[PDB]
From Swiss-Prot, chains A, B:
This is Serine hydroxymethyltransferase. It is found in: Cytoplasm. Its EC number is 2.1.2.1. SUPFAM superfamilies: PLP-dependent transferases (SSF53383). GO terms for biological process: glycine biosynthetic process from serine; tetrahydrofolate interconversion. Homodimer. Catalyzes the reversible interconversion of serine and glycine with tetrahydrofolate (THF) serving as the one-carbon carrier. This reaction serves as the major source of one-carbon groups required for the biosynthesis of purines, thymidylate, methionine, and other important biomolecules. Also exhibits THF-independent aldolase activity toward beta-hydroxyamino acids, producing glycine and aldehydes, via a retro-aldol mechanism. It holds the Pfam family SHMT. The keyword Secreted does not apply. The gene is glyA. (6S)-5,6,7,8-tetrahydrofolate binds at residues 115, 119-121, 349-351. The keyword Amino-acid biosynthesis applies.
Amino acid sequence: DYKAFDPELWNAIDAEAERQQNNIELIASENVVSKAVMAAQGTLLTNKYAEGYPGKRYYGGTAVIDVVETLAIERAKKLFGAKFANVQPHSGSQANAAVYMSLIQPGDTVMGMDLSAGGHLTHGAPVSFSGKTYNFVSYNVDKESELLDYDAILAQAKEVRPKLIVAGASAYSRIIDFAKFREIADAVGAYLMVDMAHIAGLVASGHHPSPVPYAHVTTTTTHKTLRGPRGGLILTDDEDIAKKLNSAVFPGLQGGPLEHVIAAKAVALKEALDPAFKEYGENVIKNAAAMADVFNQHPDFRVISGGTNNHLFLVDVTKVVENGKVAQNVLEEVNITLNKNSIPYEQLSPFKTSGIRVGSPAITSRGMGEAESRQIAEWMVEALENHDKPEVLERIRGDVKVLTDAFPLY
Amino acid sequence: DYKAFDPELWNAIDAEAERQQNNIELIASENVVSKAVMAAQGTLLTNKYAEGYPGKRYYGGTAVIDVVETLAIERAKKLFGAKFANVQPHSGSQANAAVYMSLIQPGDTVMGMDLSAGGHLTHGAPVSFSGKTYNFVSYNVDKESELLDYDAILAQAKEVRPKLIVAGASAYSRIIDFAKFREIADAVGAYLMVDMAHIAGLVASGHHPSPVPYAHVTTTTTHKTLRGPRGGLILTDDEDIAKKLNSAVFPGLQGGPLEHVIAAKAVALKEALDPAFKEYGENVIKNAAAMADVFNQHPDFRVISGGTNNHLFLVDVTKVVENGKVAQNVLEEVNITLNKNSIPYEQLSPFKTSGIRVGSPAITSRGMGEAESRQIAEWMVEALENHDKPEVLERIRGDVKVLTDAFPLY
Ligand SMILES: Cc1ncc(COP(=O)(O)O)c(CN[C@H](C(=O)O)[C@@H](C)O)c1O
Ligand SMILES: Cc1ncc(COP(=O)(O)O)c(CN[C@H](C(=O)O)[C@@H](C)O)c1O
Ligand code: NA
Ligand code: NA
């Protein structure tokens, strides 16, 4: 019994397990992983150094690690239909760094989605290595439709002449057209990288068309909709690019991979390969549309782009509260966790924002369905509308507890 | 249960556990972590996004995570006597990247230990981001003594004018004079960074002098001698540098931290604060020295620098077998796993090398003492001397099993 040695730490772990059980987790980038995923991360694979790749390592006694890493790779290939995979990146951010390193040079120009419009930090923020090393020039969404305008993006690319175009987002609710992004890249001789971190589980379930046949390289996190452990993954169909990607991950950016986490990737990928995973995908789509629909009908709330065809959506809350930060703090008091989030053409400070981002994967992984989704959104509307009324929130909190007990986390 | 859903994966996991049990692991960068460390990283903390730092995160639902991360931070500070710590780096390599990003600019000149004399890839190898982004100039050890020669290093630094000197190694066996390194740095107006990855547990146990009072910034892995989960850690006593390092880790290089690994870091740091860790360290030192003495006394092997004052040593094997790769493969035949390794002024190919590197931490963590260590080294000598006598190898392999049976891994 090692927990008696460190009660401060293990009490804190217990408190987080209860926090998670008693919350409605709507943070769009989160999920609830299986016990098998957790168990694999909890193995003595953490003891093993394995610099290199399967069969070409720098240390003895890696033949079993090699089987494990090869399972992950072969499963990623099979699930996503790619000819090559690298399962070593420690995160989505490292995965993306490796692609840039493989395809372009410092100072080269890159187009990626504007951060207010849902692009990631590693898609060119000035405070990220991405913006510091490469010349990123952002494309945006249409100001009226809040949709990607492929003609506008094509004309911009024709002016900019990037070496690389990055597609993918952290907060865009609509289907991204990867065929068009590749047309656009081809029109200027650019590579196309798709960062499908947020939608990888939908791509896997068949609810979002795949970037894989269109992107020269596809990156993703394994956590998020794919419902795996925290880490990165890189896919391509080009063998020469694959070799570069491999050198870039190691020795380029990383040292020894986290082979216990890689085992957990293999676990998650086999889960996503199972027919049940499609049904999970299907519910993710439905649950998010149901919550979105509630806000759509309510007159003091607008939903960015008018709705969603994926797992997430953004809501402008400024009619009802001052900003997204506030909205987040309030929903938190009724045990509903999400995050504030800039909306396209955000007017307010980055640290306030005008919006909230909502996602369905975690509640869907707990077994909730359309009715519960709808109710959760009613509750959010209701709490925001009564934010100054402690008696209302206290009641909403009570009702939330009935729902969380009914769909227990583990 | 979940193992039945995925037998190919769980069969491999179970096989690695057994392989670790049935091999004598002398790889100097490995250790055997506690069940607690592994359990921490097998928790549902993996489901939480926690970009930012305690109390200044970009998501709600982070109050307990803050408790965990803060425990990790305060325990690092305490254990190493530092005023600031950052526990988010995913790896040692990422820790190092962050520090360069914080202290210097692309193209700046940096001095780093030579890869053949024990410097790490991230200390300036042309295949690493380190050598690609910065102008690294290497220093070596003295050709005759195989020791750091602080006068030569100073003369070189005066010629080269680095903005940063990096100290620390993957394969140096003697005590490093950090006060001397800082004196050199101060003399040329350079920063000093110390990468204490290999030695951090010995710094913690009291058996290696701390670089913390002398380096502007100290990096380390939490795995290796410290006996923690895989990951990185950064320390400094300078508040302005600490702000830079934090911004460099996130949003500079990483995104979301691995909070389950961070819990595991907290676990390991408390283990290392326990008085028993001092005894572990002492055994690490005695066991490595007992192994080295066998090779010192044998006339056909030479230990680099004539011995060790830490957890590791290198042996020139070229009088008995052709190169280090051969020696590595021979030992593997008798279930002793190590790695071939360049020696200082290496004349053979990097793929072959003249050396093997041996370390004590793993066997020490299984509870082996001096007599077992000495016996292990005798078997290594005997295996290499009889590498073409299958019958001898077979007998050694059988003796090894008796020993491993007697010191169960967990
Ligand atoms: C599209 C995308 N790519 C890559 C990453 C980085 O992966 P990490 O380095 O493993 O964290 C994220 C994280 N997305 C966060 C999120 O969506 O909650 C975002 C706000 O910064 C992402 O949304
Ligand atoms: C001194 C030093 N710093 C940093 C690292 C990076 O750590 P990672 O990114 O967490 O793997 C290592 C790994 N050391 C290996 C080893 O010694 O076995 C080395 C030779 O490549 C190291 O020895
Ligand atoms: Na509305
Ligand atoms: Na000798």
